[PDB]
RNA sequence: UGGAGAGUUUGAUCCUGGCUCAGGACGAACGCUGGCGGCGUGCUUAACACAUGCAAGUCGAACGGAGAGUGGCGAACGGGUGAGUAACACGUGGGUGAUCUGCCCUGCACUUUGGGAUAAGCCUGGGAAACGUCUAAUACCGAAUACACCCUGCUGGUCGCAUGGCCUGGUAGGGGAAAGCUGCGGUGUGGGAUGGGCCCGCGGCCUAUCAGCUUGUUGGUGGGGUGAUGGCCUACCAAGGCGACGACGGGUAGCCGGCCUGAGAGGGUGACCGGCCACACUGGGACUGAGAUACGGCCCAGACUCCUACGGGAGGCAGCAGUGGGGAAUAUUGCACAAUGGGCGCAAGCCUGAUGCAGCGACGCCGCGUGAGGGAUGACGGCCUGUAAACCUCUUUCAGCACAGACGGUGACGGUAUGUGCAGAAGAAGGACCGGCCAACUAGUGCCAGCAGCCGCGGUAAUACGUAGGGUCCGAGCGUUGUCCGGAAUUACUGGGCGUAAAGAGCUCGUA
RNA sequence: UCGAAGGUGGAUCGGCGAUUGGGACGAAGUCGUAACAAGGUAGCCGUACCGGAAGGUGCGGCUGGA
């Protein structure tokens, strides 16, 4: 129904994604409902997410896509929503 | 495009007068007219005197620095050195004469290159003619 | 005018005259060669000017001026057509590109080469 | 063609003949109601409402007629019956 | 937070007033000429016709069976093009007490009970080709139960913006469903989220050489109808609606965020990228469904083209490649699902010409290379040049061959970018213009040959033509045509005029 | 019952057309000399009739008339 995607806004051989809430039907670079966060070309991948909005959209029932579900599990908004004891604490930059 | 004494001989200093000061300013620093056009349009966007910003941008060029540094005689001699990559900037190979160094930029030389590492304290003001070249355009 | 008089009827733009109508908003246009002849020019100018009638693919027939010195152009040969006036000849507003398609470049020409389509001789 | 369209053509013959049958059965039920009302026959027409209003909402339960349509039929029959 | 001008009517002058130049750009095209990287871009004309392969399949945790076949979801999304449309189509604003929503999650209650068939499989006919008898299911069906829910009657309170809403209001009548097999599901009903649908306020091209148009037309009442309000439709009464603030006609047109220009206000355009609309050979339908202009569905009618053993059939690139035409002009019948998005499945996976990339074209915007020092009585050579070369050392970016080699059980890009090594200048410069405007000057042809953006140059000494030197200006580009804005206060709202320059109706009366 | 397409008197819009009418530009070859000076009869406006052609003459007007 509603789904948390990634959308490829970069130049050639240099992708930058922004983590977008949208419909399943929409084209990849289409209209979002809301831009939550952003996110792979770094020694440490750059991941930023609004923790408040992620809990809202997951609480409604926005299904994460498979590679976004990794990023939510890393940063630990998935474990706040699910309520399982793995908790949060990851990332850094440098 | 690289140009590759007489061109200076016509000007001296080795609309009639306007073009001649631009011509020495261009063929001194070894710039092509399209690149010289770009530095003017950046200079007028910046604050202060629009003419005085132009000489700051031309003096900032990495090969110009070599000429001032005196590592290589004759600004055209440094073109042969820089593009060949002998020089280094913050531990990175700059193979580019158009590199404009900012404040706190560390220019070292590569190991070998056998034929002394001076630092940039700020971008120098005009004290360290522009009003012809400003009145040339626009 | 009064400002109410502008509200009733506005300010019309002045109607623009299109310059070269036969080309139909294209830079070049092909065509056959239906006559080849000479004319005397207008004015204190005097000479023989080579001219040709070209039916364009656009199906419009108009005079053209062959630039350069001497030409092949026989009857029923295919010819590009440029634009740009020759002001001695009255009416004549098009030109035939030289060295393109059938129209061969001018012989022995070593200066202003690009305009006349002469290939550079052996470097 | 070439596709699984060949399968979904075979379904749309099957599933039409189901829905055509139920839609037609509602018409004859609703038709026979109105002839009872226009006669001035109260006790027969009062029975035929509970016959038809049963049959309408069962067709909504199939997923044929859609419940808002099924409701607005039952509303029209009951307001006809009261007079 | 920015607003230049110049030439040309005359013997000369001032004004009015066109025409032409300097500037910036482009989905560009031609010539002459090209060395490689990075990065976007590429049928604007014929919505012209299409040969070939691929562009939507998937599940054996539903089912017989032994790939095909029934069944469930998907196929309405993704992608294409601009024909149509001057309209609630679009752009911004609201309204929905006038309504729908599969999948998704997250409350509550249930998943009771029985039957009848039909493909596959066998045996027939039909033909070049291709589309009569049996057995299962989460296929399809009689019931039961459900008090949430739908319908009708009588009545309580409150809210207000009138129909009316809401409190699952309280009552008492009548009715609504389902599926099971190895952890996923299935019906009903509250709520939330998504997507829509339908109305209206205003906004946005040309035309009166288009002045009248309308009869389901404008309204009402009772019915039909839709998810829903409505002449949406239909039967009877009423006689109204729209228009000088441009109705009804004719022409052109996808609309917009934007993009080019300008100091602005404006003018032009709607490429790529991102929304909304319409259409899928041409027209008219409906079916299935939660949802349909249903590209790669169905039916009928037409136009056009293929196969044929002449009995019969089949098909529509405005998917991606590609082909032929038309054009001054626009690309490979590429690789891969590794990455992000989507569909199905419990999952492993399996599809994806979406997408990520590669090739090709200087089509555009950037960035680097073609050498760096020293070098004179200034060799020779060409013409009335040049510290350049000659010649003395030197550096090796890109190109060349070698070795290592990616960041994003396994990567298309790719043995690629990239680094470290071996020598040697070796493999690398064009194109315009030089009468004045507007940077740069001197030596065959005779008003012929020719040049030219406007002045105007050629009728025997040419800084203007044709060639050779010498110089400028730009340089992997340089010139020329085509188009739009500017200069243009030259449609003037900002910002003009009308005695004689173009411009006061011949004069008065008077409706809007 | 509605209903595409296909059948068989006007409205609007265009292509070709024997032939014919004026316009522009070109060389200037004939026929004149109408306008600019009282241009050798002041010129021009509005009609009217006439003439190879510029033009001529009536009626009223005007100064942009010596
Ligand atoms: Mg009703
Ligand atoms: Mg003069
Ligand atoms: Mg219209
Ligand atoms: Mg469904
Ligand atoms: Mg159109
Ligand atoms: Mg202006
Ligand atoms: Mg059709
Ligand atoms: Mg239906
Ligand atoms: Mg197709
Ligand atoms: Mg389909
Ligand atoms: Mg194609
Ligand atoms: Mg203007
Ligand atoms: Mg004026
Ligand atoms: Mg008057
Ligand atoms: Mg004719
Ligand atoms: Mg006279
Ligand atoms: Mg006289
Ligand atoms: Mg007179
Ligand atoms: Mg007479
Ligand atoms: Mg008189």
Swiss-Prot record, chain A:
Please identify the protein, giving its name as recorded: Small ribosomal subunit protein bS16
Organism (species)? Mycolicibacterium smegmatis (strain ATCC 700084 / mc(2)155)
Tell me its family: Belongs to the bacterial ribosomal protein bS16 family.
Q: Which keywords describe this protein according to UniProt?
A: Ribonucleoprotein, Ribosomal protein
State the Gene Ontology terms under molecular function: structural constituent of ribosome
Q: Does the keyword Ligase apply?
A: no
Q: Give a yes or no for keyword Ribosomal protein in this entry.
A: yes
Question: What does UniProt give as GO cellular component?
Answer: cytoplasm; small ribosomal subunit
Q: Which GO biological-process labels does this protein carry?
A: translation
Which superkingdom does the taxonomy of this entry point to?
Bacteria
* Bridged cysteine pairs (disulfide): none
UniProtKB/Swiss-Prot annotation, chain B:
| UniProt domain S4 RNA-binding: residue ranges | 60-115
- Keyword Ribonucleoprotein part of the UniProt annotation: yes
What does the UniProt keyword field contain?
Ribonucleoprotein, Ribosomal protein, RNA-binding, rRNA-binding
User: InterPro entries from the entry?
Assistant: Ribosomal_uS4 (IPR022801), Ribosomal_uS4_bac-type (IPR005709), Ribosomal_uS4_CS (IPR018079), Ribosomal_uS4_N (IPR001912), S4_RNA-bd (IPR002942), S4_RNA-bd_sf (IPR036986)
Family matches, as Pfam families? Ribosomal_S4 (PF00163), S4 (PF01479)
Q: Which PROSITE patterns does the record match to this protein?
A: RIBOSOMAL_S4 (PS00632), S4 (PS50889)
Molecular function terms from GO: rRNA binding; structural constituent of ribosome
Give the top-rank taxon of the lineage listed in the UniProt record for this protein: Bacteria
Is Transport among this UniProt entry's keywords? Answer: no
One GO CC annotation, please?
A: small ribosomal subunit
One of its GO biological process terms is: translation
Task: Quote the subunit structure annotation.
Answer: Part of the 30S ribosomal subunit. Contacts protein S5. The interaction surface between S4 and S5 is involved in control of translational fidelity.
Q: Which family does it belong to?
A: Belongs to the universal ribosomal protein uS4 family.
Its job: One of the primary rRNA binding proteins, it binds directly to 16S rRNA where it nucleates assembly of the body of the 30S subunit.
- HAMAP family per record: Ribosomal_uS4_B
Q: What is this protein called?
A: Small ribosomal subunit protein uS4
> What is the species of this protein?
Mycolicibacterium smegmatis (strain ATCC 700084 / mc(2)155)
Swiss-Prot record, chain C:
Q: Name one Pfam family in it.
A: Ribosom_S12_S23
Transmembrane parts of this sequence:
none
Keyword entries, A-Z: Methylation, Ribonucleoprotein, Ribosomal protein, RNA-binding, rRNA-binding, tRNA-binding
| Region: Disordered, residue numbers | 104-123
Q: Where are the 3-methylthioaspartic acid residues found in this chain? A: 88
Say if the entry is tagged with keyword Transcription regulation.
no
List, alphabetically, the NCBIfam families matched: rpsL_bact
Similarity remark? Belongs to the universal ribosomal protein uS12 family.
Q: How does it assemble?
A: Part of the 30S ribosomal subunit. Contacts proteins S8 and S17. May interact with IF1 in the 30S initiation complex.
What HAMAP family would the database entry show?
Ribosomal_uS12_B (MF_00403_B)
Q: What is this protein called?
A: Small ribosomal subunit protein uS12
**Gene label:** rpsL
UniProtKB/Swiss-Prot annotation, chain D:
Q: Quick one: where's region Disordered?
A: 1-20
According to its UniProt entry, the protein's GO biological process terms are: translation
Basic residues bias spans: 5-18
Q: Does the record bear rRNA-binding in its keywords? A: yes
Name any one Pfam family assigned in the record: Ribosomal_S20p
GO MF terms listed in the record are: small ribosomal subunit rRNA binding; structural constituent of ribosome
* Disulfide linkage: none
User: Do the record's keywords include Phosphoprotein?
Assistant: no
Q: Name one GO cellular component term.
A: cytosol
Among SUPFAM superfamilies, the record links this protein to: Ribosomal protein S20
What's in the keyword line of the UniProt record? Ribonucleoprotein, Ribosomal protein, RNA-binding, rRNA-binding
* Family statement: Belongs to the bacterial ribosomal protein bS20 family.
Q: What does this protein do?
A: Binds directly to 16S ribosomal RNA.
Q: Any idea what this protein is called?
A: Small ribosomal subunit protein bS20
Q: Which organism is it from?
A: Mycolicibacterium smegmatis (strain ATCC 700084 / mc(2)155) (Mycobacterium smegmatis)
